[PDB]
Design a protein around this ligand. Structure first.
Ligand code: HEM
Ligand code: HEM
Ligand code: HEM
Ligand code: HEM
Lengths: 141, 146, 141, 146
């Protein structure tokens, strides 16, 4: 699922990001907006452009979101009970775009972190981002 | 997908006799029961919370019909689809806020409402030709999103 | 995940199938082969045609597979430990085609069972077929 | 996808300077580390079991290169792709047994090896144009499977 080594590889990477979590998370939000047209649809209220403090404000409550996901990584289901009772009841964001955002966070990522985003790491970061994905996704049917 | 002159006579022939009713609303009702996160574009209507009544539902049955009728213009123009659908592709983006994933989702369901209506008359042979059509429609509908 | 009602809706449906499990499962195998060209690729050894006792022989060890999945439905992970240590080590069948087979089993299904494949049922049958999917899929990364 | 005359000058301009080496083998090695079920079409080679050595790996680095070189004929012929790729689409089916899902998987990885090579030079603006290309390639490659 997540090996010690997974829980680990993940920690190096989520502590390089530091106080840049929502700097990155907002520029991952953006590229999804960018790369997939399709997803901008769960966002008709938002000022989508390079400007959008609706996106950075938005893009903060996300990485705020994953910062605290690294920390409560043994019990991911419990840490995310609310923030997935939210994705399911209300937002009802289709479980497909999650993979597009994880790849927009993943890349992100790569760019601000070239040296430390080894590949035993692009693999643990992909496991974490999928699990997060799966938790958020759960309370559906 | 440069389908037999033929699998048309069929993908057409099977289509003729979608008594366009029972059928559209069942695709409709089957979609908001099964993949329940599509009830999202649809509190525009009523009671979608126990399936006896999504089915039991008129606004659905009506919506149901309209989605299927507009699918049929597709079946009968399966050459240059992207064209037929162009305006509703254009409307389902800038007006409607539809997860274009929800299209691929409704074809998969249709090809199942169809499978159920035919039984033994709905083959292998025929399911391959409708899985050929459904995806075709979804991708003409899936178009002018920017 | 699976409500009492899920574990239930599922039982009616898997006991109508009866001694037709591998009759259906072989004609679900076939339509995947049929509908998706793509999947026939994890099968270059098999005589794919209407004939294939390689497909019915094959199509038996599958439904044999799901018959015993209805039964050990509380503990799906344990029942399927082997038959997913198999999908992961060896076969390494990409977690994508699982959704194509579930929809080829689902439809299947509909056809031999029109009356009893209500929709509170097409929804519990879809939950079961996805979970099965997820178990088989687990032992990957 | 009827891309700016422009985003070409770019999707081309960025491409020029894929020192076609370090790069292809990293896409290569990154794919069998991350999505490990692709090590399947590849015990044709050696030691793929600890990533220090998939990377550490020559047959990969070679395979790596050949996949990227043949991607480049794509970039430079991005009009009528389906054509360029037609023979290898034809070869990757009847000869090769490749999960065409594994193509979409290698573009996603590429657009990440690329993202990493450029950093700040690999934008929003540019990632949208490569996510436009990668999928294009995967679908020309994804073709004549029957
Ligand atoms: C890493 C993945 C995910 C995480 C951690 C996550 C987390 C969050 C959080 C923390 C919020 C704010 C909750 C609040 O308002 O109190 C939120 C809101 C929201 N999210 Fe998610 N999310 C994820 C994926 C997705 C994806 C991929 C989309 C869309 C395709 C999406 C769409 C939305 C929307 C529409 C809102 C509403 C915010 C608003 O009113 O503008 N989310 N999310
Ligand atoms: C085969 C697939 C689709 C076809 C051919 C189709 C067709 C149509 C048509 C012809 C209309 C009428 C619009 C007008 O008057 O010009 C419509 C409306 C609409 N559609 Fe689609 N549709 C498809 C899929 C979907 C899906 C999957 C969703 C949602 C899951 C959806 C949501 C809507 C909604 C919300 C409306 C407006 C209903 C209202 O007024 O409240 N459609 N569709
Ligand atoms: C309901 C879904 C799944 C179940 C229950 C399941 C179950 C099984 C079982 C019981 C076997 C036989 C094990 C044996 O030889 O001792 C097997 C083999 C195999 N399966 Fe799966 N499977 C599933 C999905 C898939 C999918 C969708 C594919 C391909 C896309 C696939 C490809 C294979 C292959 C290639 C074998 C090897 C059999 C042979 O040597 O011919 N499976 N599976
Ligand atoms: C951009 C994607 C792809 C391109 C453009 C590409 C291109 C090529 C080319 C040009 C060859 C040489 C064949 C010849 O001599 O005619 C080749 C071989 C081959 N490819 Fe692909 N390829 C792609 C993706 C994939 C993927 C994703 C897989 C596996 C995951 C794969 C597996 C193979 C294998 C196994 C060979 C033969 C290697 C050997 O001789 O052992 N390819 N490819």
């Amino acid at each position: 699922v997540l090996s010690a080594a997974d829980k680990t590889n993940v920690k190096a990477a989520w502590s390089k990001v530091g106080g840049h979590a929502g700097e990155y998370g907002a520029e991952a939000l953006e590229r999804m907006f960018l790369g997939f047209p399709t997803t901008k649809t769960y966002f008709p209220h938002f000022d989508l452009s390079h400007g959008s403090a609706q996106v950075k404000a938005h893009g903060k409550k996300v990485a705020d979101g994953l910062t605290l996901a690294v920390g409560h990584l043994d019990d991911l289901p419990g840490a995310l009970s609310d923030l997935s009772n939210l994705h399911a009841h209300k937002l009802r964001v289709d479980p497909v775009n999650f993979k597009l955002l994880s790849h927009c966070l993943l890349s992100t990522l790569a760019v601000h972190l070239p040296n430390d985003f080894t590949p035993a790491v692009h693999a643990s970061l992909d496991k974490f981002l999928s699990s997060v994905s799966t938790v958020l996704t759960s309370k559906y049917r | 997908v440069q389908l037999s002159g033929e699998e048309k006579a069929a993908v057409l022939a099977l289509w003729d006799k979608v008594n366009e009713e029972e059928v559209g609303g069942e695709a409709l009702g089957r979609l908001l029961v099964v993949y329940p996160w599509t009830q999202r574009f649809f509190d525009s209507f009523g009671d979608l919370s126990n399936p006896g009544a999504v089915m039991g539902n008129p606004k659905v049955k009506a919506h149901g019909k309209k989605v299927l009728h507009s699918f049929g213009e597709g079946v009968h123009h399966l050459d240059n689809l992207k064209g037929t659908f162009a305006a509703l592709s254009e409307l389902h983006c800038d007006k409607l806020h539809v997860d274009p994933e929800n299209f691929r989702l409704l074809g998969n369901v249709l090809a199942l409402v169809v499978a159920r209506h035919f039984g033994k008359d709905f083959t292998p042979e025929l399911q391959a030709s409708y899985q050929k059509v459904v995806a075709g429609v979804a991708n003409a509908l899936a178009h002018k999103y920017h």
